[PDB]
Design an enzyme around this catalytic site. Structure first.
Site, PDB file in Angstrom:
ATOM      1  N   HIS B  39       0.815  -1.247   0.000  1.00 42.89           N
ATOM      2  CA  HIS B  39       0.000   0.000   0.000  1.00 42.89           C
ATOM      3  C   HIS B  39       0.847   1.297   0.000  1.00 42.89           C
ATOM      4  O   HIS B  39       0.425   2.396  -0.459  1.00 42.89           O
ATOM      5  CB  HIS B  39      -1.059  -0.048   1.144  1.00 42.89           C
ATOM      6  CG  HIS B  39      -2.258   0.834   0.924  1.00 42.89           C
ATOM      7  ND1 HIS B  39      -3.177   0.627  -0.092  1.00 42.89           N
ATOM      8  CD2 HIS B  39      -2.693   1.924   1.597  1.00 42.89           C
ATOM      9  CE1 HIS B  39      -4.123   1.555  -0.032  1.00 42.89           C
ATOM     10  NE2 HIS B  39      -3.867   2.340   0.997  1.00 42.89           N
ATOM     11  N   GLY B 141      -1.390   5.869  10.893  1.00 40.15           N
ATOM     12  CA  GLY B 141       0.083   5.825  10.896  1.00 40.15           C
ATOM     13  C   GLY B 141       0.621   4.493  11.409  1.00 40.15           C
ATOM     14  O   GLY B 141       1.812   4.280  11.438  1.00 40.15           O
ATOM     15  N   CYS B 143      -0.102   1.416  10.075  1.00 38.13           N
ATOM     16  CA  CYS B 143       0.048   0.421   8.973  1.00 38.13           C
ATOM     17  C   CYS B 143       1.464  -0.114   8.939  1.00 38.13           C
ATOM     18  O   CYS B 143       2.402   0.677   8.995  1.00 38.13           O
ATOM     19  CB  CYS B 143      -0.202   1.132   7.643  1.00 38.13           C
ATOM     20  SG  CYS B 143      -0.474   0.017   6.257  1.00 38.13           S
TER      21      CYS B 143
HETATM   22  C1  LIG Z   1      -7.314   4.233  12.277  1.00 42.12           C
HETATM   23  N1  LIG Z   1      -6.373   3.200  11.835  1.00 42.12           N
HETATM   24  C2  LIG Z   1      -6.104   1.975  12.487  1.00 42.12           C
HETATM   25  N2  LIG Z   1      -5.263   1.289  11.754  1.00 42.12           N
HETATM   26  C3  LIG Z   1      -5.013   2.129  10.717  1.00 42.12           C
HETATM   27  C4  LIG Z   1      -4.097   1.802   9.722  1.00 42.12           C
HETATM   28  N3  LIG Z   1      -4.064   2.515   8.584  1.00 42.12           N
HETATM   29  C5  LIG Z   1      -2.990   3.385   8.299  1.00 42.12           C
HETATM   30  O1  LIG Z   1      -2.170   3.590   9.098  1.00 42.12           O
HETATM   31  N4  LIG Z   1      -2.993   3.998   7.019  1.00 42.12           N
HETATM   32  C6  LIG Z   1      -3.817   3.842   6.081  1.00 42.12           C
HETATM   33  N5  LIG Z   1      -3.643   4.547   4.936  1.00 42.12           N
HETATM   34  C7  LIG Z   1      -2.658   5.358   4.768  1.00 42.12           C
HETATM   35  C8  LIG Z   1      -2.773   6.743   4.751  1.00 42.12           C
HETATM   36  C9  LIG Z   1      -1.701   7.590   4.617  1.00 42.12           C
HETATM   37  C10 LIG Z   1      -1.490   9.000   4.536  1.00 42.12           C
HETATM   38  N6  LIG Z   1      -0.169   9.185   4.450  1.00 42.12           N
HETATM   39  C11 LIG Z   1       0.492  10.393   4.345  1.00 42.12           C
HETATM   40  N7  LIG Z   1       0.477   8.020   4.458  1.00 42.12           N
HETATM   41  C12 LIG Z   1      -0.424   7.055   4.577  1.00 42.12           C
HETATM   42  C13 LIG Z   1      -0.268   5.652   4.665  1.00 42.12           C
HETATM   43  C14 LIG Z   1      -1.315   4.857   4.773  1.00 42.12           C
HETATM   44 CL1  LIG Z   1      -1.080   3.133   4.821  1.00 42.12          CL
HETATM   45  N8  LIG Z   1      -4.958   3.030   6.276  1.00 42.12           N
HETATM   46  C15 LIG Z   1      -5.906   2.736   5.292  1.00 42.12           C
HETATM   47  C16 LIG Z   1      -5.548   1.500   4.437  1.00 42.12           C
HETATM   48  C17 LIG Z   1      -4.331   0.830   4.498  1.00 42.12           C
HETATM   49  C18 LIG Z   1      -3.975  -0.277   3.751  1.00 42.12           C
HETATM   50  F1  LIG Z   1      -2.900  -0.796   3.832  1.00 42.12           F
HETATM   51  C19 LIG Z   1      -4.939  -0.745   2.789  1.00 42.12           C
HETATM   52  F2  LIG Z   1      -4.680  -1.754   2.052  1.00 42.12           F
HETATM   53  C20 LIG Z   1      -6.165  -0.108   2.744  1.00 42.12           C
HETATM   54  C21 LIG Z   1      -6.458   1.028   3.524  1.00 42.12           C
HETATM   55  F3  LIG Z   1      -7.582   1.600   3.405  1.00 42.12           F
HETATM   56  C22 LIG Z   1      -5.044   2.309   7.572  1.00 42.12           C
HETATM   57  O2  LIG Z   1      -5.950   1.576   7.731  1.00 42.12           O
HETATM   58  N9  LIG Z   1      -5.641   3.284  10.806  1.00 42.12           N
END
Ligand SMILES: Cn1cnc(Cn2c(=O)nc(Nc3cc4cn(C)nc4cc3Cl)n(Cc3cc(F)c(F)cc3F)c2=O)n1
Ligand SMILES: Cn1cnc(Cn2c(=O)nc(Nc3cc4cn(C)nc4cc3Cl)n(Cc3cc(F)c(F)cc3F)c2=O)n1
Lengths: 298, 299
Positions: B39, B141, B143
């Site tokens: 991702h 953050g 992930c």
């Molecule tokens: C509330 N919560 C609980 N667990 C999570 C995990 N999580 C995450 O940390 N990030 C995600 N999306 C990103 C956005 C970004 C914005 N910037 C600047 N960098 C980013 C990196 C990431 Cl990974 N997501 C969403 C998500 C992550 C995936 F790996 C996927 F396959 C589908 C998804 F919808 C997330 O859930 N947040």
């Protein structure tokens, strides 16, 4: 929302084993000193009723075996500070983190690194109870395990584990070797005082419940601070101070629920019970998260 | 009984940050390879339905920013395996522990080291639910945070966190990048699937209660495994597997209570309720302590 410990690596790198005769436990190795419970100088004869200054004067450096994994560290000096023994060794601990020794207040939480024979085995969160016991998870061989908090690379050690009471709760000291609570480092049956519930923590955890979508317990009733305190006291809850209310502000502002209103909800919980329902998956009111613990996790 | 995590140090020394453009998450540095969710190669407008093959072909080693705290590790190779990216870096991690990659079953528990921007913040115990989600605690953050067990000095990695579902539970992959459950790594509402109670672990908790002298619920009956499984399902409990029966072996031996007799006991608690009574202080039966966890806390 779950119980969550600080990452333990900075403390793992400090754990050693201390032996004196057949008596063995865990020690904490920082720079060139190892800190451990003085109880290690007891033969099983001594344990029941030790005179520690007497047992100590009869000891020499060579009577102390300190092991750091495979390597034996040589003791060049010893001293006793209250219930803590300090063993000076010839070698500094290269893994010593930035650290402080702090004495915590009832209600505050910390992470415990349970260890056996100088080997870390598990990590979990505990609170200092109002009665100065802790509700830990500890088996034979855990003596000397430590509790701590971390802040921006600084480890604040606040607990060294000594013993388990008959009831299964745990007692120990700060790192200056002073017990929390009315206990002594003697193998004799000791009771703690009656425990009470950490009210400010229950309020914090109710706010966690709301942040995480669980809201069934909210009501429209309200209450003054003093009338909530009367009810709390009746139920063996610690009183809530204005300082506690202030500390809950950021959670209050986050959820839009005034502190005194969350107090009114808790009041009803005390008087009615949960009527079979749960909060954040618990059938009981949970009092071992602080407002900081909640904020940090949410 | 408390939920206890493994000490996290051996994993803390493997945590790194990985950034592609502005997209950033956590990676795991073992020897000379960094593992992370693929991702990371999505820009915002890729997240909804990425073409990962397409996004990857446009990538070179020099697009990937990997950092161990503030120190950059130069990437010298990259590849994608199922849903994880593997970045070969020019430095073998000196803190690499003895490790393996394992794929767990529902019911098994593990420690999660939650991390933000490559920096560990907390550690806690999770169980894999029968619907292949975990009831974690994770913010933005997180992930790429990993779940693990430690057996002696060996870290078995079992979980790499990808995403939070609409109900607030979490979904991710093993360290070969294969999701647990029907999920895909697309930023799209996906629903968990109806969950069930982890029967094997409830049984372990009953054994725990026996070990502690709390044994009123032991009834006078036995059952076949098939009969028990058929009843279990009517109460939204998982059916037992042969492996489950086997992992209850040590507890069964320690207490003298045959697995099938304990099944008979649980069956009665299913069919009759608790009669306003408790087990280990509680009206609710705990399903997130494995037979191993119970042995660890009792002996
Ligand atoms: C509330 N919560 C609980 N667990 C999570 C995990 N999580 C995450 O940390 N990030 C995600 N999306 C990103 C956005 C970004 C914005 N910037 C600047 N960098 C980013 C990196 C990431 Cl990974 N997501 C969403 C998500 C992550 C995936 F790996 C996927 F396959 C589908 C998804 F919808 C997330 O859930 N947040
Ligand atoms: C079940 N449990 C929960 N926490 C603890 C901690 N704990 C412990 O680990 N050890 C203790 N006594 C020792 C026996 C030894 C036998 N050998 C060979 N070496 C030994 C070393 C120790 Cl420390 N105790 C008892 C205890 C320890 C004290 F420090 C004290 F002041 C009074 C006590 F009664 C103990 O509680 N066990």
């Amino acid at each position: 929302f779950r119980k969550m410990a600080f990452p333990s690596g900075k403390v793992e790198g400090c754990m050693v084993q201390v032996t004196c005769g057949t008596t063995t436990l865990n020690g904490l190795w920082l720079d060139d000193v190892v800190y451990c419970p003085r109880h290690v100088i007891c033969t099983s004869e001594d344990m029941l009723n030790p005179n520690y200054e007497d047992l100590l004067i009869r000891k020499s450096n060579h009577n102390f075996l300190v092991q750091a994994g495979n390597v034996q560290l040589r003791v060049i000096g010893h001293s006793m500070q209250n219930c803590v023994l300090k063993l000076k060794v010839d070698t500094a601990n290269p893994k010593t983190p930035k650290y402080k020794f702090v004495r915590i207040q009832p209600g505050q939480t910390f992470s415990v690194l349970a260890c056996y024979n100088g080997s870390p085995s598990g990590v979990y969160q505990c609170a200092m109870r109002p009665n100065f016991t802790i509700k830990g998870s500890f088996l034979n061989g855990s003596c000397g395990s430590v509790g701590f908090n971390i802040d921006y690379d600084c480890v604040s050690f606040c607990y060294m584990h000594h013993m388990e009471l008959p009831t299964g709760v745990h007692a120990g000291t700060d790192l200056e070797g002073n017990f929390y609570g009315p206990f002594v480092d003697r193998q004799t049956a000791q009771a703690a005082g009656t425990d009470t519930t950490i009210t400010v923590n229950v309020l914090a955890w109710l706010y966690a419940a709301v942040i995480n979508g669980d809201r069934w317990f909210l009501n429209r009733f309200t209450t003054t601070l003093n009338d909530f305190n009367l009810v709390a006291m009746k139920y063996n809850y610690e009183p809530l101070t204005q300082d506690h209310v202030d500390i809950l502000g950021p959670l209050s502002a986050q959820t839009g629920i005034a502190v005194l209103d969350m107090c009114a909800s808790l009041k009803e919980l005390l008087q009615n019970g949960m009527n079979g329902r749960t909060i954040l998956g618990s059938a009981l009111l949970e009092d071992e998260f602080t407002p900081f613990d909640v904020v940090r996790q949410c």
